[PDB]
């Protein structure tokens, strides 16, 4: 047989979000200038080309804090992190360059893309 | 905004599986009976009752070996597993009994129900 789960991935996703509420299994903290925000490198790597060439290094893999580009906008960061769990991106007329820019550093290709495609219509 | 990427889920799934195949970050093995299942503690939980309250204890949230009732059909549990990182779930007449006994002892109502519409149709 071949039977498909349509919503299983997005209920995983879910659950992952819901184990980074509980700081449970987190793995990595991220510094952001003065924030800081815990996640799973998993995820991360999983949705990042920096996070992914970052942790698939086996000289960087084991890293517990990852400090990163200190004029990285920290709204913008956790704008992008919540994607990352959730599938859904918060884009305001107030933050749509520091996210597309954030995006861009963080190697999300689809999400600069449509930051572009939200941008020529705003 | 409110933007929803539909495949996001699905394409952090499938990275997920692809750090398993590459054995990145795995962070426990399941051990049944001979058989060694090398996995992710979060996907576990995020996918099975009895691995969320096993790993949800901090009494066992940092085990690094779970050794699951030698009862257990490894094909059986495999499947499960390969479900629980692609969404497809792959039942044959000579595994349905073993993958709908196997999801009852991991907790995975929603495969046990799909298990019996199966059979309905069997
Ligand atoms: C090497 C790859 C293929 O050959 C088999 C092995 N494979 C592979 C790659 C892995 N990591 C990555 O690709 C890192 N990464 C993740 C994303 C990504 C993912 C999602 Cl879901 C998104 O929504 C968006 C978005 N909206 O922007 C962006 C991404 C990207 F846009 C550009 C570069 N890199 C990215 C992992 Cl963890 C495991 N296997
Ligand atoms: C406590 C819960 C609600 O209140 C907020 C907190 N929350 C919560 C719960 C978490 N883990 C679990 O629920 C463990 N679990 C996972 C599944 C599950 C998941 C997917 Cl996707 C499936 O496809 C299937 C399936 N086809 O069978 C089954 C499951 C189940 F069917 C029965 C019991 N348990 C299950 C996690 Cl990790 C983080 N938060
Ligand atoms: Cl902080
Ligand atoms: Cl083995």
Do not use: W
Request: proline share 2%.
């Amino acid at each position: 047989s071949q039977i498909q789960f349509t919503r299983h991935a997005s209920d995983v996703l879910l659950n992952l979000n819901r184990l980074r509420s509980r700081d449970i299994l987190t793995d990595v903290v991220i510094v952001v200038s003065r924030e800081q925000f815990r996640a799973h490198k998993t995820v991360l790597m999983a949705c990042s080309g920096l996070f992914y060439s970052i942790f698939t290094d086996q000289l960087k893999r084991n890293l517990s804090v990852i400090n990163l580009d200190p004029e990285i906008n920290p709204e913008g960061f956790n704008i992008l992190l919540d994607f990352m769990y959730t599938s859904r991106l918060n884009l305001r007329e107030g933050n749509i360059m520091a996210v597309m820019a954030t995006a861009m550093y963080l190697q999300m290709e689809h999400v600069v893309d449509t930051c572009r495609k939200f941008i020529k219509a705003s």
